Amino acid sequence: SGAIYVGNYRVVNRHLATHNDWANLVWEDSSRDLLVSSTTAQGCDTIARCDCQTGVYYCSSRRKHYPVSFSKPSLIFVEASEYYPARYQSHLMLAVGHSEPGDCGGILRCQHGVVGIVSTGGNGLVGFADVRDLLWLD
Ligand SMILES: COc1ccccc1[C@@H](NC(C)=O)C(=O)N1CCC[C@H](C(N)=O)C1
Ligand SMILES: [Zn+2]
């Protein structure tokens, strides 16, 4: 689990969005595994606007932060799960690092701010849903 809180927006993995997120829906994209909802209180986070390919992410299954080298946002095949059919997920960045299904929502950050959140993984890989292109979050 995990969310980004920026301005009057809450960014979460679409497959983990609550009844409340859907009732205050601003934008969602099944192909990116992202959902944005509106909030009344002002958020604590700031978004990176950069081309960084190194950063640090929080891994809840280890209660630890790990440094990562990650690929540019791209279209990657993701096997069927209990939440989605087999499909291509867009705006996804892969990296070598530990992740388990419940790690989704962990924030990836560079020196410029929030880059994205954990969305995929398996076998020593961790994938992050990019949010740096969503300029309207600011
Ligand atoms: C953090 O994700 C994982 C970690 C370890 C193992 C497996 C995973 C993920 N499976 C894959 C095929 O990437 C996973 O559990 N997902 C279920 C929820 C939706 C996710 C998505 N489609 O973006 C996929
Ligand atoms: Zn950066």
From Swiss-Prot:
Where on the tree of life does the source sit, at the highest rank? Viruses
**Where is the catalytic site?**
15, 33, 104
Q: Where does Zn(2+) 1 bind?
A: 50, 52, 110, 112
Instruction: Spell out the reaction equation it catalyses.
Output: Selective cleavage of Tyr-|-Gly bond in the picornavirus polyprotein
**Role description:** Cysteine protease that cleaves viral polyprotein and specific host proteins. It is responsible for the autocatalytic cleavage between the P1 and P2 regions, which is the first cleavage occurring in the polyprotein. Also cleaves the host translation initiation factor EIF4G1, in order to shut down the capped cellular mRNA translation. Inhibits the host nucleus-cytoplasm protein and RNA trafficking by cleaving host members of the nuclear pores. Counteracts stress granule formation probably by antagonizing its assembly or promoting its dissassembly.
Q: How does it assemble?
A: Homodimer.
Protein name, as recorded: Protease 2A
Q: What is the lineage of its organism?
A: Viruses, Riboviria, Orthornavirae, Pisuviricota, Pisoniviricetes
Q: Which residues of the full protein are shown?
A: 869 to 1006 of 2193
